[PDB]
Amino acid sequence: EEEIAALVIDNGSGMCKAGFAGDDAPRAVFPSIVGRPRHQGVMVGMGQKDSYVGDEAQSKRGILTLKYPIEHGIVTNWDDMEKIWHHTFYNELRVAPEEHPVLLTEAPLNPKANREKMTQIMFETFNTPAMYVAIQAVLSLYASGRTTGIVMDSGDGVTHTVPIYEGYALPHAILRLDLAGRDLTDYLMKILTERGYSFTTTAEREIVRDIKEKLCYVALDFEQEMATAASSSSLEKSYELPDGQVITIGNERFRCPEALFQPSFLGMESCGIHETTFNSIMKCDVDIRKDLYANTVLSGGTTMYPGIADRMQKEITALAPSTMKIKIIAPPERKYSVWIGGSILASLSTFQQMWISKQEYDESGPSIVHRKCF
Amino acid sequence: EEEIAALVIDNGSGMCKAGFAGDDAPRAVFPSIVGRPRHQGVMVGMGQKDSYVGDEAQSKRGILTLKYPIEHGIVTNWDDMEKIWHHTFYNELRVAPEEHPVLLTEAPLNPKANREKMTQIMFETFNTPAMYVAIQAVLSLYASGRTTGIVMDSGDGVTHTVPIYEGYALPHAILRLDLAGRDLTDYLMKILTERGYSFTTTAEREIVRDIKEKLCYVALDFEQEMATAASSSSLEKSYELPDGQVITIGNERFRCPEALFQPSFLGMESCGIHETTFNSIMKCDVDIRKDLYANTVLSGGTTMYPGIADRMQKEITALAPSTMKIKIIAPPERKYSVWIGGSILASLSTFQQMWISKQEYDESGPSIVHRKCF
Amino acid sequence: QLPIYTEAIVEMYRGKKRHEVPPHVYAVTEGAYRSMLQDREDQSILCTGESGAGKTENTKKVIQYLAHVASSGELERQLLQANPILEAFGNAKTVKNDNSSRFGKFIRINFDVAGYIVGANIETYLLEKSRAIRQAKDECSFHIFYQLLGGAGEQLKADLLLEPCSHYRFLTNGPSSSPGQERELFQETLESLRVLGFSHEEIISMLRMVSAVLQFGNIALKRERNTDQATMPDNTAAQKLCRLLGLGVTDFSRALLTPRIKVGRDYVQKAQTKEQADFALEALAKATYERLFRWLVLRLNRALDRSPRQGASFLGILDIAGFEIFQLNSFEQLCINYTNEKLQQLFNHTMFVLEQEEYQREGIPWTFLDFGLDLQPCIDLIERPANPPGLLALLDEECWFPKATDKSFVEKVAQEQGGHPKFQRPRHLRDQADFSVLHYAGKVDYKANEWLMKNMDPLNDNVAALLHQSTDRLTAEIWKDRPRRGMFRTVGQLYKESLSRLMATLSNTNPSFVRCIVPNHEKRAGKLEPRLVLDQLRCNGVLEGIRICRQGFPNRILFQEFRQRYEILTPNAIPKGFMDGKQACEKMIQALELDPNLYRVGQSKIFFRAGVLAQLEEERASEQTKSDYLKRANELV
């Protein structure tokens, strides 16, 4: 075949988004979880299967304890990650990685060890001709088809912010904020408890993740919505648990995402996301700011909440000079923006020379990741 | 021969159900009773036979006092148990236990001593190559051919409840309730006495056991049926005693099994069986409950009463979320479910390595029962 | 058709060793006959599966020899007549061949101590009964089914109530025409039965049950909302069945759906799933067919007449399908392979004892491993029930355990038994087939799909009992029945048992071996397709035989021959002629510089490795080149 295709994998914590480069959507997207049988089984002709990976784990949740191998964009446990990748290639895609160059995503400002060790695995686990490790934000910017913008990247892992102008990139200006979907989830299960509902275990932690993925939304003004919580009508929603129990969540709903804008709720000093965006833009040269204000791109799973764009717009506009208009461009399909970006990058002809080649690695070692790529 | 066959014995109190592993029904099933001649005989060329075991005792009831060696899943008297096993092997099956591995059932949450001492006997009474001691509920779940369910196991011994999901098993969730066929019998002979019929002795205690095994049934609503007892037509039934006396039992019929649902009748606080099932399910992880509500399996002799399934369905449905449908799967042939399960387990190839070997016992002692098996 | 098989040739063969004459069947069967009168022990002739080859036709020629030798009313000419019967019932149109024997045929020719024919009987060990229920993607079931369908007129069809192929669930892949016009073949087969002396009545009865097996398909069990048990809302089909047998519809309906089981001494019902009852239906189909087949063989042997019985000994002739390989290779393929494994092993053992005894006859003591052992680990891989359990055993375990999938099966066998060197998991990209083993023939790939379903053959004792009570003579007589009988009972298990019987029978006797190959598809001579012959050499074990004998000392030459023939080799070593012919060889081997590992000194012969004589022959052509040169030069100059 010509070009051999190429493989693309986005692993921020939470989800693996994988598929062939050269396609508009990934084939396989499943949770990055390694569940292990915590309870000793007593039958015969079970499994045994030491552990389960991917949406298999979601299916068989109750038995397993689930461990997310990636936290804050850092891989805690490598064998687990390897297992997840194994599952992606063999269980879903059904590819021999020897037959494809593979692109990995990775978060900014992230420890060297992850990049280096990541590459070490790809070469000395799944024998592969070539690979590349790329910054998440840039990829989403490509996916949006814009050359310039400040990409607000918040996955389940961590939140990141990379201003870009006319390609280029500003290292000093790049900002990385420790908040995530996962931290919102931890907050949310906390806030439920004041209602009586107690979710103590990893299994049901994912149930609240599911709740947040739909029920929660961001206030266009927090205090107003909280005021109107007095007369509860629309702000309460019934949710059905798999157990059959019913949950009813009022104001607690929208204050969950509020945390992004008020990390004091979580107890961290680190400024809210909008202020971090200012922190990034303000670090940039005076000249370019005009378009960064106007070209803010949101990406990642934890920007999905309804109404986030609007709130960011209102806050940024409030803070900034009203001399210039602040457009925020947040597409739907943002969740997959990183992966799409990866697809487009591996599809690019010129890119086909920038790969880290197996050969190059074998001569020069794992450390070469930083040398060559950003 | 290949595989040597294998032997299976279910001893919850009341009945020994024994036969070859690898068959759909046991060969021998007889009451676990050791009758002793209480009255001194005066002839010559009698017996003497110090005692009788098995349905022999049933045949010659009047003379004997019967002693059930097992109470509440605990063996009161070991020599008696040994005698019963003796009878099973030599009198019915006609096997040398040296030539067969033997599987025993045993109830959950049961004293260690019973398992340990059980094994001690099997090795140092009937010399046997290998043996295993297995939980009653699991076996019935196998017999039902389902991988998941909450098995309500009530024999004559005691009642037990073990939720199982996808194999696995939840120790904390396992529930054991002190009610049984035998307690119903004791209640029943009490309740007859208000009608005039007085059954004071072990002999006729078994007569009432027999009555209960047919005449009694469970109300689909207790109070309604008791109300309709005013106009007695169908609720009375004539029963014939072996004496030739006739008994006529009305409302007293169905309130006997009612006890399972209202142990206040018996004077115990311990919740009714349906509530115990909820106690089990509620102990389990939120995720799996959906299928446990739907997969409740009834086993054991004292689930045989007509209408039990329906009542359990109505009560559980009433208590639970009506968001999810509560199927109860109670097969006919449930009585033998444990033994069938044993047959299927010993038939399994892989199981053939999990046996407790004679050798292993000889090195490691009797205590190894818990170490190896559940 | 070759001029061979005259009387002069056969007479010519008599009482001689195999080397003494040219290769022929008459020779090997002469070996068998002579070994019997000589050794007074029974003999067996193994023919390995090849078409369609006319293996039977050849075997008729073997019988012809047998008749002429043993004397003192023609031969059993009805043996020719038997072929279409067993062919019709037993064989099916498959990818390899349009006619192929599924069942093994064991033909016993009974001989008195005098060496004369007392009579003969046929025995049929292995059958694939699962073929009737279930089939390959592009193949046909047994011939009789199709030839019944097209062949029977309204006269017979109206009794049997046969329908076209589309009507039956049990018939896969539709009609799958196949004709051949058919119908004519069926007509031939009826006469073939009749001459044998079965009554028209009996034939009609037979054909009725052959319908009955097919009818088991028309029954539909419908799963019921909420309850497990399922049921049969449509009485029509099973009503038809009940007409076709002795069964009362109601009796059968209760029995099938909710059977009663003896939990001694008092009976109790059972709940059965839809799946379970379906398997029971398929079981009774399959078991019914098997029973039918068995009865045909026995009734046939009654149609064969014997003189004074029980005297004295027999010669078995085994016709069975050889080691098979397809692209896909399903379950039946595995069973076939398993049997061919054991047969091959017997051959190795036989060869082993032959060589070991040959060494003693030549006075060479040598110890070497049993050749049979080569196959043994592969056999244990498939068979061994216990410590590590076998593929068949593990399959059975999968089948019974509650929610069994094919995937759980393969995973389980990998986990349980992957450490086995003959077992190979392909892994990674496809590799369409999900696991593979390494036989004598080579590496074969297996697809695990629907193996659990093929394996299940639970049999209801209740329905069986009803059959035993049937009104009609035929079926009731058939069902005139220990193991795990009832539920459990798996096809793999039964098959294994049946093979064990066969291996015992063959093992009792002294076997002899014939290997048949077809050159081409053409059905014409003068064309040998090397690839096809390679393939056949793989599956018949002949390659294994060569790789066996190589391990020993295959080339055996006498002293005298070795000296007279090869003397040219070493003028130096060979003395002035002390003679006795031992000393010659001593000298020759000595100066020719050969490893003592590579030969032995025997009484009448020297045993040689492979390639030793290749070197020596090269020294004879080199020596001859030297001598050609010296001669030609001397004459010239």
Ligand SMILES: Nc1ncnc2c1ncn2[C@@H]1O[C@H](COP(=O)(O)OP(=O)(O)O)[C@@H](O)[C@H]1O
């Ligand atoms: N539909 C949704 N609505 C709101 N929040 C969501 C939704 N889907 C996912 N999330 C949140 O975003 C997270 C997924 O982020 P993801 O894009 O997988 O990050 P990454 O690409 O870095 O792995 C989830 O864990 C959840 O907290």
Ligand SMILES: Nc1ncnc2c1ncn2[C@@H]1O[C@H](COP(=O)(O)OP(=O)(O)O)[C@@H](O)[C@H]1O
């Ligand atoms: N046909 C029946 N109908 C109602 N109750 C029965 C019936 N048969 C037995 N029982 C009750 O159940 C008991 C038998 O339980 P069993 O299955 O022997 O327990 P285990 O298996 O633990 O020994 C009897 O003592 C009786 O009280």
Ligand SMILES: [Mg+2]
């Ligand atoms: Mg991301």
Ligand SMILES: [Mg+2]
């Ligand atoms: Mg019991």
